[PDB]
Design a protein around this ligand. Structure first.
Ligand SMILES: CC(=O)N[C@@H]1[C@@H](O)[C@@H](O[C@@H]2O[C@H](CO)[C@@H](O)[C@H](O)[C@H]2NC(C)=O)[C@@H](CO)O[C@H]1O
Ligand SMILES: CC(=O)N[C@@H]1[C@@H](O)[C@H](O[C@@H]2O[C@H](CO)[C@@H](O)[C@H](O)[C@H]2NC(C)=O)[C@@H](CO)O[C@H]1O
Ligand SMILES: CC(=O)N[C@@H]1[C@@H](O)[C@H](O[C@@H]2O[C@H](CO)[C@@H](O)[C@H](O)[C@H]2NC(C)=O)[C@@H](CO)O[C@H]1O
Ligand SMILES: CC(=O)N[C@H]1[C@H](OC2[C@@H](CO)O[C@@H](O)[C@H](NC(C)=O)[C@H]2O)O[C@H](CO)[C@@H](O)[C@@H]1O
Lengths: 142, 142, 142, 142
C-alpha cells in the first residue's frame, strides 16, 4: 500500500478561502480511498501506479485541482488552475493517464510543484516526506 | 440550479460503520460541487442533467456508492454494492451517461431506492423533498 | 493515557438528524483532546479520572449531551436530554464533579446507558471495548 | 441572535499544523451553538453577552485557545497561548466572566487581536465584518 497525507495551509485571506468540493480516485493499482483525520487528508492507494484528485473552490468562486499519486514507486503531484465549472475532478483525474494531456507531469514524479493561477492565486504541493510508502505533503494556497 | 442535501442514517452497528471515501461530480450541466454543513452533504449542480457520487467504505471493508442527481428536471438516485477496490466512484459515475450500463436507473428518475448487498447490508436513498430545485434525501444504511 | 473512540449511529429519521454543536474536556487527569478520524470521534485523556462531553442538536431543535470518561480505571457514560439552550456542555460537564448533581452517574462506571427524551428520542451509549486504555463505544440515536 | 463565522488561515508550515480539539459555549445570553459549513466555523448565540472558545493543538504539541463573543452589542476576541494540557477550553472560557483573569480583554470589545506564543507562533483574530449581528473573522496562524 501507498499513502499520501496532506496538510492544507492557506496563507492569504485576500485570495479568499478554499474548501474541498470533490475527491476522486483513479482505478489503477486496486484504486484507493480518501480519509480525514485531525484536519488532514490522506489518500490510501492499493499500490504504485494510481492517484487521487482534490478539487477546491474558494468563497470567491475560483476552482482548482490538486493531484497526488505514485508513479513507478515515486510520488508525483500537479496543480491545475483556472478551471471551468464543468471541468470537475472527475474530468481532470483521468487526463493523467491513457496518453491524456496531463500524463507528462505525472511522469515527472515531482516531490514539489507550484503554479500561479491567472487570477493571481499561488498554489504549491510540497512533499515533506518524499520517500517510502507513507508520504506526506503540504498543500499551500497563496 | 439544482441542489441535493443528504442526511446519512446508520441504523445497525452489526453492519459496521461507513465513512465517505470519495466524492465525484459529473461534468454535464456546468458540473457542480459537494459541500458539508451541520453533518449533512449537499451536491450543488449548475443545472438539470448532471449528478455526483458518494463512495462509502465501512470499517469492515464493505464498499458501496450512492448516486444522486437530476435528470430532465426530476431527481434520480441509485446504489451500487459489492464494489471492488478498483471500482472507484470515478469509474462508476460516468457509467450512468453516454448510454452506459447504469444509464437505465438514472432514466428511472427514482425518488426512492433500496437494495441489499450480497453480504447482507441494506442501503436506501429516500427523498424527503421530491420536487423543486432544493431536494432533500435520507441515506439509510442498515 | 486513556482514549474513548465513538461511532455515531442515527437510526430513525423521524426523530430528526443530530449534529455536534459543542465538545468539552474536563480539566482533571491533565485534561484531554477531541479529534476526528474517518467519521468517528476520539477523546484522548491524560489519565484516569476525567471525561469529555459532546453536545448534539437535531435539525428539529432537540438538545442533548453525551458524556464519556474513565473513573477509577473504568469507563463511564451518561446522556442528558431535554436540555435548554443555556445548558451548554460547558455547564453540564463540570456537573459530574466536585459533588455536582451528576456525579452519581459517573460513579456508576456504566459500560452502557440509554434514556428516552420527553419528546420521544431514544439515546444510547454502548461500549464495544469495555476494558483497557483504548475504549470503544457506539452512540445510538433512535 | 448573533453569529460569528470564522475562517482559519494557517500560513507557516514551520509552525506545524493546528487542528481543533475542543469547542465550548458560555451559558450567558441563552447559550449558543458551534456549527461547521464549507470549512468554516460559526458560533451562533442567543443574544449579546456570551461567547465560545476554540482550542487548537498543533502536530508539534502547541496548545492555544481562540475566544470570540459579543459584549454589549460589540464583537470581542482573545487568544491565549502556552496552555498546559489541563487548561482545557472548559477552563479558559469561564475565565472571561465573573471577574475572572481574562474579563479585561473581553471588555475591550476588540475587532482585531494578535499575539505571539513564547515558542514563536503568531496568532491573529481579525474581524472582516465588525458590525451587526452577523459577524465575520479570519483566524490566522503563523
Ligand atoms: C484542458 C486545458 O485547459 N488544458 C490546459 C490547462 O489545464 C492549462 O493548465 C496547466 O496544466 C498543467 C498540466 O496539468 C499543469 O501542470 C499546470 O499547472 C497548469 N497551468 C496553470 C497555469 O494552471 C494550460 C497551460 O498548460 O493549457 C490548457 O490547454
Ligand atoms: C462491474 C459491476 O459492478 N458489474 C455489476 C454490478 O454493477 C452489479 O449491480 C447493480 O447495479 C445496478 C445499476 O447501477 C444498481 O441499480 C443495483 O443496485 C446494483 N445491485 C446491487 C446488488 O448492488 C452487480 C450486481 O447486480 O453485478 C455486477 O456484474
Ligand atoms: C438542570 C436540570 O434540568 N437538571 C435535571 C435534568 O438534568 C434531568 O436529567 C437526567 O439527568 C441524569 C443525570 O445526569 C441523566 O442520567 C438522565 O439521563 C437525565 N434524564 C433525561 C430524561 O434525560 C431532569 C430529569 O431527570 O431533572 C432535572 O432537574
Ligand atoms: C502570550 C499569551 O498567550 N498571552 C495571553 C495571556 O497569557 C497568560 C500567560 C502569558 O502571558 O501568563 C500567565 O501568567 C497567564 N496565566 C495562566 C494561568 O495561563 C496566562 O493567561 O492571557 C491574556 C488574557 O487572556 C491574553 O490576552 C494574551 O494573549
Amino acid at each position: 500500500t501507498y499513502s499520501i497525507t496532506l496538510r492544507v495551509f492557506q496563507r492569504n485571506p485576500g485570495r479568499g478561502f478554499f474548501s474541498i468540493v470533490e475527491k476522486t480516485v483513479f482505478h489503477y493499482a486496486n484504486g484507493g480511498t480518501w480519509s480525514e483525520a485531525k484536519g488532514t487528508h490522506t489518500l490510501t492507494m492499493g499500490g504504485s501506479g494510481t492517484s487521487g484528485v482534490l478539487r477546491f473552490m474558494s468563497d470567491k468562486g475560483e476552482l482548482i485541482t490538486v493531484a497526488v499519486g505514485v508513479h513507478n514507486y515515486k510520488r508525483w503531484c500537479d496543480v491545475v488552475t483556472g478551471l471551468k465549472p464543468e471541468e470537475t475532478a472527475l474530468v481532470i483525474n483521468p487526463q493523467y493517464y491513457n496518453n491524456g494531456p496531463r500524463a507528462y507531469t505525472r511522469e515527472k514524479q515531482l516531490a514539489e510543484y507550484n503554479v500561479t493561477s491567472v487570477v493571481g492565486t499561488r498554489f504549491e504541493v510540497k512533499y515533506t516526506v518524499v520517500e517510502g510508502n507513507n508520504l506526506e505533503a503540504n498543500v499551500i494556497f497563496s
